[PDB]
Design a protein around this ligand. Structure first.
Ligand SMILES: Nc1ncnc2c1ncn2[C@@H]1O[C@H](COP(=O)(O)OP(=O)(O)O)[C@@H](O)[C@H]1O
Ligand SMILES: [Mg+2]
Length: 378
């Protein structure tokens, strides 16, 4: 069976395979080309991917996500301490190692973060296998450039327990560059900036490629800035609107909020191609159907400060790598949030009209690159 490339993301994962000189990003059962990094446990089953995310609103304590934030980390870790204050599922301490605790089939169980990630990895494997019609064994999995030895180990382990022979763990920025062929030798040093604005993390990496050898000169970003924050701005906006028209605050009702957030995320996606989108939610609060809409203009202004602040980490990355705007040769967009028109305008204006590399869907770029690398490695 061919070796596959797997992008194990914080919010979404994606799998691609290199066949006949072309890379194919494989779609799941629901036809999506990316699958949520979600796992859910119920009375009767274990849900993974779309099925898991599609039921979070009613099973918050038993629906796990953000496992990538825990992987390879300790319970005492300040990061873990801060983060766990925001998850509806519980994190327990098992001899210094953090574990997620859920109720599966009425019984209480706990999993190490690598076990949860292995579940998502298993889903990608069977998605590839379904498509290929053959067993998938070898794989190249990607990881952020900033992951340390423990995090890389844990990611590798998540793979082995998923029945995957991890050929190699390569950095996400490097994978993105390989997708565009920016790794080909042109007899000269090339500086490339990877702008990765995903579902929950933002990362800016500056790579220097010489003779086909990558060198991460600098990196910057924010581990808590992503498409989720954009959705939230919309949510808070609609909560206020609902209160105006119906004099009813729905903030307390967790289900109404979660359903609204789902509708916002979807509208947001439409806003990247259309200038307006409608939100049609039946019986949002009590028996009130919430029918409304948003314009791209309004969306842009709701997140103006967030979008704009995106340039700060870019300036920082530049100065650390000791380069001027003019010195970077290529700029590649990675992450689902980069499909947002305002973000593309903003970055391009910053780089004085420089063209952006974005022919490959940004949320598929890393998987795409990993597949090519998997191919050569086999
Ligand atoms: N058309 C789009 N416009 C804006 N955001 C989008 C669009 N398509 C996907 N997204 C967003 O991208 C994020 C997913 O990013 P992705 O790169 O797939 O994952 P990850 O950050 O997990 O690596 C989500 O916040 C999703 O709403
Ligand atoms: Mg990503």
């Amino acid at each position: 069976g061919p070796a596959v490339g797997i992008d194990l993301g914080t919010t979404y994962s994606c799998v691609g395979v290199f066949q006949h000189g072309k890379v194919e990003i494989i779609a799941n059962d629901q036809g999506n080309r990316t699958t949520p990094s979600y796992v859910a446990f119920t009375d009767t089953e274990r849900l993974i991917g779309d099925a898991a995310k599609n039921q979070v609103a009613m099973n918050p304590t038993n629906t796990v996500f953000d496992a990538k934030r825990l992987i390879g980390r300790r319970f005492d870790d300040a990061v873990v301490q801060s983060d766990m204050k925001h998850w509806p599922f519980m994190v327990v301490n098992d001899a210094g190692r953090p574990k997620v605790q859920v109720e599966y089939k009425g019984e209480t169980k706990s999993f190490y973060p690598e076990e949860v990630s292995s579940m998502v990895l298993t889903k990608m494997k069977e998605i590839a296998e379904a498509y290929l019609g053959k067993t998938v064994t070898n794989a190249v999995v990607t990881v952020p450039a900033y992951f340390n030895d423990s995090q890389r180990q844990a990611t590798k382990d998540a793979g082995t327990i998923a029945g995957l022979n991890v050929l190699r763990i390569i950095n996400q920025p490097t994978a993105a560059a390989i997708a565009y062929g920016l790794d080909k030798k042109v007899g000269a040093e090339r500086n490339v900036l990877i702008f990765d604005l995903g579902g929950g993390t933002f990362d800016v990496s500056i790579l220097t490629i010489e003779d086909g050898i990558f060198e991460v000169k600098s990196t910057a970003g924010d581990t808590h800035l992503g498409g989720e924050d954009f959705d939230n701005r919309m949510v808070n906006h609609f909560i206020a609107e609902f209160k105006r028209k119906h004099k009813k605050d729905i903030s307390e009702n967790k289900r109404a909020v979660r359903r609204l957030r789902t509708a916002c995320e979807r509208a947001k996606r439409t806003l990247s191609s259309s200038t307006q989108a409608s939100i049609e939610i039946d019986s949002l609060y009590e028996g009130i159907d919430f029918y409304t809409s948003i314009t791209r203009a309004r969306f842009e202004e709701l997140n103006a400060d967030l979008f704009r602040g995106t340039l700060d980490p870019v300036e920082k990355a530049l100065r650390d790598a000791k380069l001027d705007k003019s010195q970077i040769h290529d700029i590649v967009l990675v992450g689902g949030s980069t499909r947002i028109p305002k973000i593309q305008k903003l970055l391009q204006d910053f780089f004085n009209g420089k063209e952006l590399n974005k022919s490959i869907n940004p949320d598929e770029a890393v998987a795409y690159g990993a597949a090519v690398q998997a191919a050569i490695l086999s």
